[PDB]
Design a protein around this ligand. Structure first.
Ligand code: FAD
Ligand code: FAD
Ligand code: LMT
Ligand code: LMT
Ligand code: DCQ
Ligand code: DCQ
Ligand code: H2S
Ligand code: H2S
Ligand code: H2S
Ligand code: H2S
Ligand code: H2S
Ligand code: H2S
Ligand code: H2S
Ligand code: H2S
Lengths: 421, 421
């Protein structure tokens, strides 16, 4: 309300949870902060591939949100938004209730666009998903069914995907788990299908020796790999794959039987956000300026996967660049600073900073990780790492992030860099 | 003097130059800051290998100090200290003049311990040095003489060395330059001799895949490599090498003719500092606490290569861990903070922080670099990088560091990390 702006945060994920705490900390008792999310629990997304192979359980990576934000004075609504009216500034919830806002911060993350590939929905066929704990559990269930009746395995990433790391991770740990169970030789064929122009392109034109190292890794595991692929449909338990050359000309089509499969889908914006007129590009990603403010509505901000970021390259099969944790947190930090500024007259000048990508993958005893910045080459940092220490770091960071999600963040979040001091 | 402490900084190198500026900035006009150094010019040490092969000239990497520190109000004495009397707090200069201090900050860097290996002094035989611009020029001169009369080449690192990167760098660019001149096939043999237990140990038990990558690099260049070596003497233009096994038992002795050679020597403390009773360990390195204060004299501090750092490992042939730029700067920063604190009653609690090692090497078009921390494994960061971007970064950092040495530093120095903001 006037003189006491009501700030709503839509989505309680990697960006959204921290945003709720930071907003409340920045605004204080004189303003209402409301967090709205489809689920009543927080999940640590990077741990889902492990749930998909059964190395982790839901309880390890998820927890109920309500008590933790409420003791901070944040209102929490565990309800999905179905409609956003940016004119009236009203949000319509799944139960038909309406919530008004003075500022809205959109952190709704990706819609998994299974519809791009008929038959690819995890509920429609053998191609599963590990992006959410709900999907990863279903993936693991189908993995167990594979163990009972071995058959061909197909893991990879669809056309338009932007999150390639976890597909590589998942293929590796599936291969690893199979060995452990003494079941690897029961597998007729193990295939990796990707929209990448080459192995380890990762939607970022490669980083360090990602190409060489991921190529050798897949080969060590007896995983046959195909690049420049798009899947046209999944039908009768078969994946119909089309492979192109540099000029997008078809050089072959394949039909792959699939007993167990997992393809990372293309990401779009969620329907309630995409549905807002003039808010989003055709992909449903919120068009924002460098201050995280929507270009159309001055009182709508966005952070996380939900925002639009222009491509810097074009691949033979469409692919996108990933939006990862540190950049998301910088986005969140900027949005909160600039909203608070608005509330106090001044114009916030804070930006998300330099584009970057960071990813950690754990194979069990050893991890792989990379850091790339900025987006276009030659970069200022372009590094790929592998080893037991990367694994230890993943474990440490997960423990830290989850604890922080329960304790609240102020916060200039990433000061876990004081491991220098 | 009383109420106006006189602070002296001994050594105008990587640690010393910044220390002079930071001291003056921290203390201001009420205190006298004096910089004393053997040479009247600053040199960018990491560029010396390039001077040693002739890819760079003295003028590119060195500049006269006086005008730059004096316009900051810093007194500059271009004279070597011969004696330090810590009781009377007097420094005796080469010309016999004496300089008194209330606080002394020692940044004298390494003494190149050629005496450990009879005949190894660059002025006594064919084994040259690239650690200083004076030595690197002499190295290049002998390189040109090699071109006139090709003969065997021997490059590497002595027993007790702690700075291995530049030996690898130098071997690589010598090989590279030879090719460019169409002279590589005129070389009878090209040998790399190191005290490391294995290739790419680098005195830090390896970092990332340094072992694999440096091994392959030397092999690509037709450079035959030997580890676990110590050189017992250089005589009649031959290098007498002893190789041991894991238990330090001799497994062979070699006699290597040398037309052109360069071995990184072991580092000790400079004589004037080592000469101070109770100041140093037997190596001549200043024993300091975590606040950079000498354990014996409360008004003597030290930073840079000059300080003693305990070994965390023991190799078959003695070797040491390197002391590199970022850690040196943290040392400097801490010493300055704690001296200023002393001057104002309080006890400074600032420390150098976590042990780390960082090194950049440029091969011409592409560079290699690493970061390791902390000292002992498993590390929190253990990364090796290679590529054109590393080269671009070396070029950039050198340009930046030199400009800063002319303009002065305040300063929380390394904020060239805002390439994130
Ligand atoms: C398998 C996988 C592995 C990954 N690994 C890494 C890694 O190692 N390192 C790294 O930096 N990044 C990693 N990421 C990338 C990234 O950081 C995550 O995807 C991250 O969770 C995205 O943050 P977000 O806040 O934008 O979206 P999300 O975390 O998905 O949060 C979005 C939230 O808003 C909600 N929501 C959606 N629609 C509505 C609605 N209509 N109404 C109400 N709520 C709604 C959601 O249910 C959810 O809680 C990974 C991503 C995936 C899928
Ligand atoms: C070949 C080589 C390559 C290197 N490359 C890297 C790299 O890529 N990255 C990195 O972080 N580090 C690198 N280093 C390591 C390191 O950072 C440097 O050695 C650095 O110059 C050390 O800083 P310092 O202030 O301790 O000693 P120095 O830089 O040697 O400065 C010491 C100074 O004090 C003086 N002095 C000595 N005795 C006296 C005396 N009795 N009286 C008066 N003055 C005296 C000197 O003449 C000199 O000016 C390299 C070192 C070498 C030798
Ligand atoms: C971050 C997301 C991106 C992808 C995530 C999942 C990808 C899977 C990674 C496959 C790598 C497997 O293969 C593994 O790679 C590295 C090669 O650098 C090798 O390891 C090599 O370099 C490392 C350091 O980085 C050294 O410690 C090691 O001694 C050396 O052999 C291993 O011998 C090999 O077994
Ligand atoms: C920092 C100080 C330590 C040592 C300094 C001097 C050491 C010399 C380095 C020798 C390396 C030469 O060999 C070179 O190594 C890397 C291997 O990772 C290869 O490069 C490989 O990884 C890089 C990324 O890191 C990719 O961009 C490249 O496409 C891939 O082939 C090169 O194909 C090879 O030519
Ligand atoms: C240039 C800055 C790089 C920061 C990286 C160092 C430590 C943090 C790891 C990155 C990371 C972040 C930020 C992160 O937010 C996140 O959760 C989604 C991860 O998944 C485990 C991450 O691996
Ligand atoms: C954990 C912190 C790592 C910092 C490294 C990023 C940028 C700086 C490069 C390191 C470096 C420093 C600090 C440095 O002081 C120095 O001069 C002696 C170099 O030689 C060229 C260096 O390469
Ligand atoms: S997925
Ligand atoms: S991703
Ligand atoms: S990724
Ligand atoms: S990722
Ligand atoms: S040297
Ligand atoms: S060094
Ligand atoms: S080094
Ligand atoms: S170095």
């Amino acid at each position: 309300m006037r003189g006491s702006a009501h700030v709503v945060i839509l989505g309680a994920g990697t960006g959204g949870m921290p945003a709720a705490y930071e907003m409340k900390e920045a605004l204080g008792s004189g303003h209402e902060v409301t967090l709205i999310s489809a689920n009543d629990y927080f999940q640590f997304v990077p741990s889902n591939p492990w749930v998909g192979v059964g190395w982790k359980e839901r309880d390890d990576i998820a927890f109920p949100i309500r008590h933790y934000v409420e003791r901070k004075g944040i209102h929490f609504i565990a309800q999905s938004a179905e409609q956003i009216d940016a004119e009236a500034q009203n949000i319509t919830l799944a139960d038909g209730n309406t919530v008004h806002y003075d500022y809205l911060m959109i952190a709704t993350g990706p819609k998994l666009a299974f519809e791009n590939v008929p038959g690819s929905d995890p509920h429609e066929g053998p191609v599963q998903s590990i992006s959410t704990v709900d999907h990863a559990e279903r993936a693991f269930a189908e993995y167990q069914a594979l163990l009972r009746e071995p058959g061909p395995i197909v893991i990879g990433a669809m056309a338009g995907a932007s999150c390639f790391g976890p597909a590589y991770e998942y293929a590796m740990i599936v291969a690893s788990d199979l060995k452990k169970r003494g079941m690897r030789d029961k597998i007729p064929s193990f295939t990796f299908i990707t929209s990448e122009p080459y192995i380890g392109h990762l939607g970022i034109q490669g980083v360090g020796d990602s190409k060489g190292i991921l190529t050798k890794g897949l080969k060590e595991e007896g995983i046959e790999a195909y690049t420049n692929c798009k899947v046209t449909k999944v039908e009768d338990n078969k994946m119909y794959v089309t492979q192109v050359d540099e000029k997008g000309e078809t050089i072959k089509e394949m039909v792959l039987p699939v007993k167990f499969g997992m393809m990372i889908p293309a990401f779009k914006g969620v329907p309630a956000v995409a549905g807002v007129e003039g808010l989003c590009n055709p992909g449903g990603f919120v068009l924002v300026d460098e201050h995280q403010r929507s270009k159309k509505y001055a009182n709508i901000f966005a952070a996380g996967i939900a925002i639009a970021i222009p491509p810097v390259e074009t691949t033979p099969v469409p692919t996108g660049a990933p939006k990862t944790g540190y950049m998301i947190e910088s986005m969140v930090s900027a949005a909160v600073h600039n909203i608070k500024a608005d509330l106090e007259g001044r114009k916030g000048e804070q930006t998300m900073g330099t584009w970057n990508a960071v990813c950690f993958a754990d194979m069990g005893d050893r991890g792989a990780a990379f850091i790339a910045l900025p987006q276009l080459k030659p970069r200022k940092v372009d590094v790929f790492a592998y080893g037991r220490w990367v694994h230890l770091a993943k474990v440490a960071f997960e423990k830290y992030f989850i604890r922080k999600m329960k304790m609240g963040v102020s916060e200039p979040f990433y000061e876990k860099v004081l491991f220098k001091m």
